[PDB]
Nucleic acid binder design. Structure first.
Length: 71
DNA sequence: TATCCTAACCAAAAGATGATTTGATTGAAGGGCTTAAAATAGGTGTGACAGTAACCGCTCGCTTCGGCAG
């Protein structure tokens, strides 16, 4: 279930640890790197942009702290 | 589409990696000692010497100045 990555590393059998396995998976996890879009992400992105943006300047990536699976 | 992620790459903050320059240290030498001795030749100031110097709780005895005396 993408959980207990110590067990995942042990099952891998190449002497990897949980942290390395998780790092590699997250760097190649479609669920994390959101090529997709969701309604709540769009709504909250619009809300934060409208709250903060002045003129043509918006906090393009500082919104990522609030919305998951982004950069 | 409006917008984004962030694979691989461009612009900028910050975060870091080694070579070079400047602030700082010091190793060795100029130097200028030491007592230890032995010595002739010396000059006087000064510091003892010494002196005067000066400055710094109860109960008797004794006395006087008037108020009548002479």
């Amino acid at each position: 279930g993408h959980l207990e990555w110590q067990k995942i590393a042990e099952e891998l059998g190449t002497s990897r640890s949980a942290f390395q396995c998780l790092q590699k998976f997250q760097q190649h996890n479609k669920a994390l790197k959101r090529k997709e879009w969701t309604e709540e992400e769009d709504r909250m992105l619009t809300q934060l942009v409208q709250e903060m943006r002045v003129g043509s300047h918006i906090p393009y990536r500082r919104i990522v702290y609030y919305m998951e699976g982004r950069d």
